[PDB]
Amino acid sequence: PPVLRKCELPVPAHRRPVQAWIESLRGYEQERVGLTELHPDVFSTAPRLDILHQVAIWQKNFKRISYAKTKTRAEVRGGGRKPWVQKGSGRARHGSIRSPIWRGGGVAHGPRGPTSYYYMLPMKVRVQGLKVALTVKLAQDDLHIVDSLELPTADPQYLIELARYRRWGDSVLLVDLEHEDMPQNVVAATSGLKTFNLVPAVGLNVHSMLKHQTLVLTLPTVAFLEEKLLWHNSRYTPLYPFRLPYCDFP
């Protein structure tokens, strides 16, 4: 009983879909149990290694809000009086004992208040970031497709030996379509491991893919990704935000 999956969305005429093996986690040797076709415009796009740099940096410097605030000479406690008369004393002229020159003075140029680094890349660049990351993972044999993502037991040692036998690298990223639909065996097995992490399909992004040396996609999630990522190729600019009702985008 082979498990097959043919692409639903219209593949462009001038190209052909790329194919990858379908695996199962119910056994160590239960690999290559089918064949699935992957859309070329998502899993076989151009290898943009500089559009990944923008997205990877963006996910790092888009929520950073610093909390460093040093006190300038205005906010220091005292020093409201001239220390000594300017002429005749014989020393250098000063105007406060809290100026940046003095020992206890403030900072002339320091970090001022909580600073926010918030910049949003255009959406089509972020979408292009996901497409290239998936293509890079597939092109280097770091992408494995798992059918329905079930495990024989909840013992976390089972996953460790399974990855060792198949040479899945040091870290594996497991995905699922929805949070409430994740089976109990997989959740309990991956809850006690550090290098193995389970994330819903909505929690997939560039930084997570590059953090873990192996990406595992479930067949229902593969159809979910292709539907969401190929919609931006032939869409209109948003007259109003898409959360509001649209004619053919609920």
């Binding site: 082979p2 097959l4 790329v18 194919q19 093996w21 064949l35 089972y158």
Partner: protein
């Protein structure tokens, strides 16, 4: 759940590769000319899985995910199994390369 021993990613093409491939094609294709069996297409998803799985469990060497879109004809997979794959690193290749009597290497990790 017995853990199987770890496989080895080392493949050497045998002398009977021509016979094994043609025998496998006949039992899973039975479609085209017996002589020009190297021009048979692999477009069908089910047919490709039926043909590649048999080779994987017979030669103990599976075509990876990246190269599946290239293996579309019988000649393509025949050429794939004519290319040896070595799992040893460059150093292990160097450590047995008939080194000169004065070169001494001590791998310590």
């Amino acid at each position: 759940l017995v853990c199987p021993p770890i496989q080895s990613r080392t493949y050497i093409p045998p002398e009977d590769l021509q016979s094994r491939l043609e025998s496998h094609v006949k039992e899973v294709f039975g479609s085209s000319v017996p002589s020009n069996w190297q021009d048979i297409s692999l477009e069908d998803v089910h047919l490709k899985f039926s043909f590649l799985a048999r080779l994987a469990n017979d030669l103990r060497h599976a075509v990876p995910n990246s190269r599946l879109h290239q293996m579309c004809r019988v000649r393509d997979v025949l050429d794939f199994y004519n290319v040896p794959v070595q799992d040893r690193s460059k150093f292990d290749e160097l450590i047995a390369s008939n080194l000169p009597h004065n070169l001494k290497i001590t791998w310590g990790y």
